[PDB]
Write a protein that binds this ligand. Structure first.
Ligand code: HEM
Ligand code: HEM
Ligand code: HEM
Ligand code: HEM
Lengths: 158, 158, 158, 158, 158, 158, 158
């Protein structure tokens, strides 16, 4: 079904966001794993899988709408060298994507692409979830201190 | 453990190869899926997962060897517009990566990084497997003709 | 038990036939497999196993009859380069072996080696079965055409 | 994938070795069985199956590398007339094949056919295993004497 | 159904053979058992049961063909006083019966009693099996010596 | 099979390394256990078992190659009096053994003892694993502080 | 709990005995295994595990008593080149350790270290068991002769 061009541009832009997130989350995950921070590896890995699911949904939708999914261009990764810096970087990234999602959703509504909108709102709900988790972790680091926070990541949560 | 610098460069280059393959295979997969070529979607999807496993192994190894995995730079994707063109493009990609793998393996041996070598030989064996599958599909297309080949992709293989 | 010498010669000759068939069927099988003709690989492989069972029975019988099984001499393989040619070659081979079997059976009867005869008649019945299958495949190729025939070999039969 | 020609020659030569071993082990097996040496029949039979697995791997690899597997030429079998002679003959055969394998492995490495190499190293490890078993049996025959050794072969090992 | 008279004579003669074998095998069995040669008792007992099955088949066939089964006349038993002598005696007996069977089979064919023939060929195959076993035991006795052979009969084979 | 003498010397030297590691890991384990550091006892104990498996493989291989395994000479243990010191000492030991392994592997390749090489590469991969674990623990001690690190060892990991 | 110094010296001396036994039994085991003496490998291996258990108990007890377990010094191994010699050597070793154990037990009683005593008496009971087994094997070798004894080791005991 031939979709609205600008919706497809938005879908590719959102896809672009998820594909930086996929990589940034995966590197973070295995960095944590290397450091023995088993629990942060588990969560961030699962967030990488999450963003993959999102990318998949965009790709399928762009294809359905008869556009060309763009997996060639990759935005700036910001990796960071310590836990806080890396968590903070994932948070900034989620925040910029939420912003883009809010914009795309409003526009999809105005051209009547209600199913693209509906798919985007579910994705935003997952992002808003990641935002919740990242914010909480960052606050825990301040409240309990860095040493205690690290000790609490050594064992995976059952 | 501080690894050999040039081994790490090779590992990042190989990682680079897998990360273009991951995307190219995934897009191909969902293109096939959109076209209703269910079987080609199943196989190519499973090859995308495969290349992810490889990327993961490189990332973990670079990290262990104390280098910086590079997920920022992404090489040229070549997507193609029909089945043959797309299969042929995946084949050219596997062929270039096999070449890089052969080179890296020889060098790892000469600096005594036998475990990096061992990991790379297993990966090359998986690639060589994908090469086998792609070559066979491309020959089937010529032997049975394009129409018959497409009909044979409509149902997933149990 | 000391057997009739000429029966043993026949047994070795028949053994010789099975041992060329074993190899020819196995190579054909893996050629088909390489080409992705999964179904022809399954059947021809199972025919290779079949001829092995036959060879085993000859070997045991020659030994029981106190002769020397001959596994040293190997007759002409005729491999062929395409499906028809290869199928036709297996058929010619079965036909020559059936001829030898008919001759050996008649002779075993006339020297009263009824158990060798009985074993040979069961083998001939298996060969006659392979002959049936090969003839049918070759006719299917003409009736449905080569392209359709090949497409029909891509998936293994459950 | 077009392989190195000389690698293919080596693969065919190794294949040639396995195919003499297949037959020599099988005849030995059924000779032992006829003599009631149940245990030697069980082991040697299982070694025949082993060499078949090896031949299969060569055949598939030659085919993948786009060469012509050679099952037509069969090297000298040396059967022998008693246990020691026959065991010793299998040992000489394994020793010559190990020699060929060592040469092929070194050459595969130097043309970068690392997966052929990897396959060959696993095969050599199985051969080295057969060598171990044969050497041990031959020493047992001297240590316990031939009569005791034979009595020990009458019952199959659970 | 009124059978050929001479076929019935042959059937009774063969029956006569089995009925001496039944007794000779049973006595041998329980002699071995008494001597503690548990394994030879197991096998020879099972051969006695075997010959009973054969007698049964003759009896039923003679009756079907409307003749009178003869269980009154019993040929010469040759018991023997030691293992070798007794094994050798069972072997001579099987050899004479195989001779009779060969003759009967040829004659049944020439009067078209194909089912009597078919029954006789299966019996001959069982006899040929007993012949194999006896020959092997007698050769084992020479190869491993009498003392070792006896020790090997003390425990039953699982 | 008569092996290369210098390969056997290397195998004995590597065996020597594993046998110091076996003892050093076991003492460390039970020291941790005594101190109530349950988790460090579990891991180090499992590393002692690991090094035993390695010693076993060397011993068997030396024996196969017809050399004399040397379990008489035992290198310097360095025990240490606190967690860091003891972990650091295990790390120095793994590092020296990895060095020896790298040398032995290269030499085995040059005399064509590919199966010894293959066994050594698997062992090196296990060592490289222990190196990873030790390095991570030592870094955790600095990152979370000694008191927090110790508290984290009190309970065994499920 | 601060133990008696001389008890700790005894514990270390006994530990020293077990650690030579561990190695001597393990080498013997794998020597038997190499020779195909499967049964002697099974038993001696299990005795090596046994002596490890003993070493473990000493190590834990020395640590509890606040002494320093000594795994650095290793007494004279006496390996031997044939079965008898090797069995005899394990027996001499058990005999010397039993002597040391008797001495240590008496002394532990006189300084009131009743739990060390109790642990040592259980160990002595296990040693006395090994002594029983070794003595019996050595006598069996004389009673049945070396050839028969070896044949009896070829199969593992269920
Ligand atoms: C390039 C860096 C990437 C890495 C390192 C990576 C890694 C992984 C790994 C390790 C898995 C687990 C394999 C499994 O399913 O068992 C996985 C799953 C998956 N990946 Fe990726 N991935 C990457 C990018 C992508 C991309 C670009 C896509 C396409 C949008 C994608 C799609 C998927 C999907 C659909 C799954 C299955 C999720 C599930 O059901 O568990 N991945 N990935
Ligand atoms: C010419 C003398 C040979 C004899 C007497 C022989 C005999 C046998 C027998 C009795 C079996 C057991 C059947 C079964 O799988 O249940 C077997 C299995 C097999 N044979 Fe052969 N064989 C011979 C040569 C070969 C050759 C040349 C090849 C090809 C390389 C081959 C390939 C195989 C394979 C792949 C199996 C299946 C193994 C398994 O999964 O158990 N054989 N053979
Ligand atoms: C005269 C000496 C014989 C002796 C000492 C003997 C002994 C035995 C014994 C101990 C059994 C096992 C009983 C069972 O089935 O549980 C048996 C079975 C049997 N016997 Fe006899 N037998 C003799 C002759 C015969 C004869 C002349 C016939 C008739 C042809 C015969 C027919 C059978 C049959 C049909 C069985 C059953 C086999 C089975 O299913 O296990 N026996 N015999
Ligand atoms: C001398 C100090 C040693 C100590 C204190 C020690 C301790 C232990 C203990 C407690 C076990 C567990 C028993 C079990 O398997 O359930 C074990 C297992 C084992 N040990 Fe040792 N050991 C020592 C040296 C050695 C040596 C030198 C070898 C020979 C290379 C060896 C070979 C083995 C093997 C093969 C196992 C079985 C592993 C398994 O399957 O769990 N050990 N050791």
């Amino acid at each position: 079904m031939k979709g609205d061009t600008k919706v497809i541009n938005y879908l590719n832009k959102l896809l672009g966001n998820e594909l930086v997130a996929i990589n940034q989350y995966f590197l973070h995950a295995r960095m944590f794993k290397n450091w023995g921070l088993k629990r942060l590896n588990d969560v961030e890995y699962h967030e990488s899988i999450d963003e993959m699911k999102h990318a998949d949904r965009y790709i399928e939708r762009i294809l359905f709408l008869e556009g060309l999914p763009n997996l060639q261009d990759l935005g700036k990764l910001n990796i960071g060298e310590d836990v806080e810096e890396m968590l903070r970087s994932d948070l900034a990234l989620e925040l910029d994507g939420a912003k883009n999602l809010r914009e795309a959703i409003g526009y999809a509504d105005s051209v009547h692409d209600y199913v693209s909108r509906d798919m985007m709102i579910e994705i935003l709900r997952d992002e808003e979830g990641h935002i919740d988790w990242l914010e909480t972790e960052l606050d825990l680091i301040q409240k309990m201190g860095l040493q205690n926070y690290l000790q609490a990541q050594i064992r995976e949560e059952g």
